[PDB]
């Protein structure tokens, strides 16, 4: 359910 | 109740506080991409995306209600030409469209150079933990937390629910635990690896003070 | 690490903070009876038992390392004559003996008229939550919590662990939840029934601010 | 509007400020501010609360002037009960307390109460909360202690105006005595502080100061 | 001892205070304090940080006097690059920034920077944090906003001493302009506040004030 | 394991 | 004024 | 002194 930071 | 020695009084508080709002966003939904760290000299920076306060909800008309590859795929497809993003501000509670040009030609991580995370923007301004005092050689100190300037705005997680700061710190008591920390000088997010220890040799398990509430929100300018 | 824009400095803090202490108590153990509410015009009051800071460890030489009926039984047996209690102060970190005379002849609840609870006194001064601002018609407001004067020093519980204030409030989100609250004007504990509600119509689930740390401890006099 | 702020309701002590003013018999708005109350004293037994209580009348006589009357009346009725009219800045109410001035208790004075003649107008508002306190600072050495202590003034010495920061613009070299309330002892004490802008640290006292609703002397929920 | 307090180590900004003082070329301890920096300005492009930066020299010329030199040098080199020596109260370091004064940018001034001549001695210490702010208070109406705003002075008007509480002992009727730093905008602005001790609430501004380490303008962890 | 306040 | 004991 | 724009 929990996402996590990533770079775009 | 007898006679209360207290009464009610009016005080100024930020617009982004203390109501019921699922918002007025086009395309429906209540979730978007929370803008965390914004790299300097990046397309994202130039586009005006402000860390913590901005949520990306749509890109070129496409609503982002899912944590999928749509956002990167759309950016990949329109690389080096302008793209229109619909942005919601938890600061102004308003929606605005910013043009932005993803690129490979800039020396930084990503096409936009922006750390993001998919979550909900309802009362996002309330889930902030103000770092108060910080003891020497404390877990907080060694990790990189700094007094009063830093605000903990959530954590990268193990599937620990709910993660309000405190219910993390006794679960991660053995080893870290990663935090997302906002700083009001840099006005930007950074990732901090802290290792809690109730027997570290001082106050609490981090060795720092924590503030929560109106007296401890991330500051907002007087006018939009 | 580059050059840190921060340095270390010396500041005054209460003796009852930030060390490793299982204490020097005679009879061993690390647990006793935490003195909460002390009724006015009571034997307990006359004996000088100060709320929150005092722990009863021994009575007439008998160490109290168990949550049993020993303390009341001993009080019952020596009713209307003086009894000697060994008391530990989380304030002064010292042990003192106070004489006290349990009685039925005073118009109040109990033989001593003192609310107590069996727990450990290691770092008990650190498990305090300072109530900051309090919104009108908030759960905190209606319950009886008052700004800055009140300190939450724990809760009466359902077998919810660990109960640090926050990990209670989303578990009890339906209905209360009872709290033990210290007030620095009355210098005494009282029990508050609060009903959390994340959708109450304002800040957080209590509608109040919370402080934790050296800036938010229960205040201590300059000298013992 | 364009403002990023709005109004909200918050609980504040009734002892504000500025809901006023005076229903005091004999008129006036000034009385004797109760500072330090010594233990095992007539003052203590009488229920005189430090900082919050103002003596307004004694045996029907209004004390709206700073004279020797209060002393004389106590002197004349030594070892006898006198009734005092007291105003509370906490409850904004007037109450009558009986008290018996005496020498037969082991303490200084007949009541054993340090007092000062001033006005109870917003007296709850003129308080400065001592925040952090550096090691070996002027504040530290004097006896000021972090967060528990509140400076309520003053000690004059004396002429125009001069409340705290506008006090410490003078004495920059020489000593200064303050009235300090402590929330543990719930009592006032007099401390000799000597400012030094070059003491080797923060400010001239080496301590933090808080002013406002977030930094008042604490109040119980109900009277 | 008998003291219920002890010493402990805590992290504080390096921009204190009182670890001092001056290694500045040309001697002196005074320069031009950088207040407001307008957007899209030469000042902005040059990297001039509000509040934390002091202009010390321009093209080798030390600015230890409050004269028209700085204006003249900028005037003489309009539309050309000039090199400025800048002292940071944040990092306690000296740095050289190139800057090009111009009229060709849509803003007031050649640099587009509000400045004031004073000393950078402990300049990080003379700050007052605006805490709570009542509705319809003098502070509220003027534009002061809770917790985000920091009063760093002053606007003189002018003679001896006079820093903030010891400012607002004057103007009790008439208007007063302040220099206010905001941690969201990270910039200074000038606000006209008019005190009124009988405004109908707390103090004379109707706001809370914080002073000290707990109430400084925030600093990033690393330079 | 958790106790609960009582009066003496 | 000044403070005194009674 | 007093503040001014450059």
Author numbering:
A (entry chain C), F (entry chain C): 12 to 19
B (entry chain B), C (entry chain B): -15 to 208
D (entry chain A), E (entry chain A): -14 to 208
G (entry chain D), H (entry chain D): 14 to 19
Sentences from the study reporting this entry:
GRASP55 is a medial/trans Golgi molecule that is involved in Golgi stacking, Golgi fragmentation during mitosis and the unconventional protein transport triggered by cellular stress. The cargo receptor function of GRASP55 was attributed to the interaction of GRASP55 PDZ domains with motifs in the C-terminal part of cargos such as CD8, TGF-α, or CD83. Members of the Junctional Adhesion Molecular family exhibit a similar structure with two extracellular immunoglobulin domains, a single transmembrane region and a C-terminal PSD-95/Discs Large/ZO-1 (PDZ)-binding motif. We demonstrated that GRASP55 interacted with the PDZ-binding motif of JAM-C in testis.
Therefore, we co-crystallized GRASP55 PDZ domains with peptides corresponding to the C-terminal 19-mer of mouse JAM-B (JAM-B_P19) and JAM-C (JAM-C_P19). The bound structures of GRASP55 with an uncleaved 6xHis-Tag crystallized in the I4122 space group and contained 2 molecules in the asymmetric unit. Notably, GRASP55/JAM-C and GRASP55/JAM-B structures exhibited an unexpected ‘closed’ conformation that was characterized by a 33 degree rotation angle of PDZ2 towards the PDZ1 domain and a 12.1 Å root mean square deviation (rmsd) after superimposition of PDZ1 domains to the previously reported structure of the ‘ligand-free’ GRASP55 PDZ domains. The cargo bound conformation may be preferentially selected in the presence of C-terminal JAM peptides. These structures indicate that JAM-B_P19 and JAM-C_P19 bind to a groove on the PDZ1 surface, and C-terminal residues penetrate the conventional hydrophobic cavity found in this PDZ domain. Most of the observed interactions occurred via the last four residues of JAM-B_P19 or JAM-C_P19, where the carboxylate group of Ile0 is coordinated by a network of hydrogen bonds to the main chain amide groups in the “carboxylate binding loop” of GRASP55 PDZ1. Residues at positions 0 and -2 are inserted in an extended conformation and present supplementary hydrogen bonds with the 5th β-strand, which adds a 6th antiparallel β-strand to the conventional structure of the interface. Following the nomenclature for residues binding to PDZ motifs, the JAMB_P19 peptide C-terminal Isoleucine residue was designated Ile0 and subsequent residues toward the N-terminus were negatively decreased Ile-1, Phe-2, Ser-3, Lys-4, Thr-5, His-6, Lys-7 and Phe-8. Notably, one very unique feature and non-conventional interaction of GRASP55/JAM-B_P19 was the positioning of Arg101 at a close distance from the interface, which allows hydrogen-bonding interactions with PDZ2 domain amino acids (such as Ala139) and Thr5 from JAM-B. Measurement of the relative binding of GRASP55 to JAM family members using homogenous time-resolved fluorescence (HTRF) or isothermal titration calorimetry (ITC) revealed five- to seven-fold higher affinity interactions of GRASP55 with JAM-B and JAM-C (4.9 μM and 3.7 μM, respectively) as compared to JAM-A (27 μM).
